[PDB]
Structures are given as structure tokens and as C-alpha cells.
């Protein structure tokens, strides 16, 4: 399947792909204003994820870091990303569909839209302000809004028991997004599409 990466946003962001165990195509790669990366994932990936990163410095060898969505200090990740990270999650050829979301579960860094590039099914969106508008408790210092389960560590944000409902803050997540993921627990916003879709995610998609 092919993801078109787009950057609209007008900051360079450092876009990432991977399944947590592994990278998707080079896992990683600088996306300037403006431009578009496109990457191929391999049908039935289960559990792939997309996400920005940001105020990235990475050496000639592709070792460094970013202040948001870091993957264990690699340009190419290898391994999902330092929260606050907006997600654009999909999992491929599962009994014949693709499924789609995004995701506020592990915070908000750059707006996105995630959408197909074929027939069959609509796209999810969460472009609000989430950072300028983020609870000052969420706020972090290094840069984004992050989820209540980061900060607090709790049972009830981390949803560990398979036991929880919703918060203030996932309900800030919610308010400002309502077609993401704000919590574990939240009533599914994941889009069915036809097996073997082709997508494109669009950082900063309306400015």
C-alpha cells in the first residue's frame, strides 16, 4: 500500500512510520514545507502507526534527537515515537478491510488528516489548536500537549485495568477533536475501508 506523506505545515517536520517492532519502508525521513514523502507499507501490517516529529538534529549518521515523537534518537525509527505524538494508525488486509484512525491516546504534537487516495470510504481529521488551546497541566515543556496517561501515570488515564471512562482531559482531547481517539476506552472513531487502500496523511492539512 502507498501513504503519501505531505508536510502543509509551515515548519520542517520529521515524519515516522513503524509497527513498534519494526520500520515501515525507511521508518523515517525530513519532510520541509511543502513537501511529500511517499512510502510503501506491506499488506497486512497490523498495528502501523504515522506521526510528525518536530525541532529534530540529527548527525550524519542519523542519530540525534527531537523534542517531539522522538524514536530512540533515530532519523530511520525503528519504534514508535516520544509522547505528545498525534497518530495516524491503520492496520492492513484484516479479514479482507483496512482500518483507520487518529489517535489523542499518547498526545497531541502537529495537526493531521488522514485520508484514502481510493474509493470506498472517508477520512478522519484532527486540525484544531490543540497545543495553544492544551490545559496548562498537559503542556509540555519540550514542546506539545500531552495525554493525562504521560503526566499522571494513573490507572484511570492509563486505562491498565481494561477499567476506565472518561476524564477532563480526554474530554479536552475530545472536545477539540471528536473524530480521534481520546482515551482507551473511547467510542471507536476507526473508519473501514476496502482492503489494500492507499492513503495520505497531511500534516497541518488547514494552514
Given at each position: 500500500?502507498?501513504?503519501?506523506?505531505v508536510n502543509?505545515?509551515?515548519?520542517?517536520?520529521?515524519?515516522?512510520?513503524?509497527?513498534?517492532?519494526?520500520?515501515?519502508?525507511?521508518?523515517?525521513?525530513?519532510?520541509?514545507?511543502?513537501?511529500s514523502?511517499?512510502?510503501?507499507?506491506?499488506?497486512?501490517?497490523?498495528?502501523?502507526?504515522?506521526?510528525?516529529?518536530?525541532?529534530?538534529?540529527?548527525?550524519?549518521?542519523?542519530?540525534?534527537?527531537?523534542?517531539?515523537?522522538?524514536?530512540?534518537?533515530?532519523?530511520?525509527?525503528?519504534?514508535?515515537?516520544?509522547?505528545?505524538?498525534?497518530?495516524?494508525?491503520?492496520?492492513?488486509?484484516?479479514?479482507?478491510?483496512?482500518?483507520?484512525?487518529?489517535?489523542?491516546?499518547?498526545?497531541?504534537?502537529?495537526?493531521?488528516?488522514?485520508?484514502?487516495?481510493?474509493?470506498?470510504?472517508?477520512?478522519?481529521?484532527?486540525?484544531?489548536?490543540?497545543?495553544?488551546?492544551?490545559?496548562?497541566?498537559?503542556?509540555?515543556?519540550?514542546?506539545?500537549?500531552?495525554?493525562?496517561?504521560?503526566?499522571?501515570?494513573?490507572?484511570?488515564?492509563?486505562?491498565?485495568?481494561?477499567?476506565?471512562?472518561?476524564?477532563?482531559?480526554?474530554?479536552?482531547?475530545?472536545?477539540?477533536?471528536?473524530?480521534?481517539?481520546?482515551?482507551?476506552?473511547?467510542?471507536?472513531?476507526?473508519?473501514?475501508?476496502?482492503?489494500?487502500?492507499?492513503?495520505?496523511?497531511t500534516?497541518?492539512?488547514?494552514?
Open positions: 500500500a502507498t501513504f503519501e506523506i502543509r505545515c509551515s515548519y520542517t517536520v520529521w515524519a515516522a512510520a513503524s509497527k513498534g517492532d519494526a520500520a515501515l519502508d525507511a521508518g523515517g525521513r525530513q519532510l520541509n514545507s511543502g513537501e514523502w511517499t512510502i510503501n507499507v506491506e499488506p497486512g501490517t497490523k498495528g502501523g502507526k504515522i506521526w510528525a516529529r518536530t525541532d529534530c538534529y540529527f548527525d550524519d549518521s542519523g542519530s540525534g534527537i527531537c523534542k517531539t515523537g522522538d524514536c530512540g534518537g533515530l532519523l530511520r525509527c525503528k519504534r514508535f515515537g516520544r509522547p505528545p505524538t498525534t497518530l495516524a494508525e491503520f492496520s492492513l488486509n484484516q479479514y479482507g478491510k483496512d482500518y483507520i484512525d487518529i489517535s489523542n491516546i499518547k498526545g497531541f504534537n502537529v495537526p493531521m488528516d488522514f485520508s484514502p487516495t481510493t474509493r470506498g470510504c472517508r477520512g478522519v481529521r484532527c486540525a484544531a489548536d490543540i497545543v495553544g488551546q492544551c490545559p496548562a497541566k498537559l503542556k509540555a515543556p519540550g514542546g506539545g500537549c500531552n495525554d493525562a496517561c504521560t503526566v499522571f501515570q494513573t490507572s484511570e488515564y492509563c486505562c491498565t485495568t481494561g477499567k476506565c471512562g472518561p476524564t477532563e482531559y480526554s474530554r479536552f482531547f475530545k472536545r477539540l477533536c471528536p473524530d480521534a481517539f481520546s482515551y482507551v476506552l473511547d467510542k471507536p472513531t476507526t473508519v473501514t475501508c476496502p482492503g489494500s487502500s492507499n492513503y495520505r496523511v500534516f497541518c492539512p488547514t494552514a
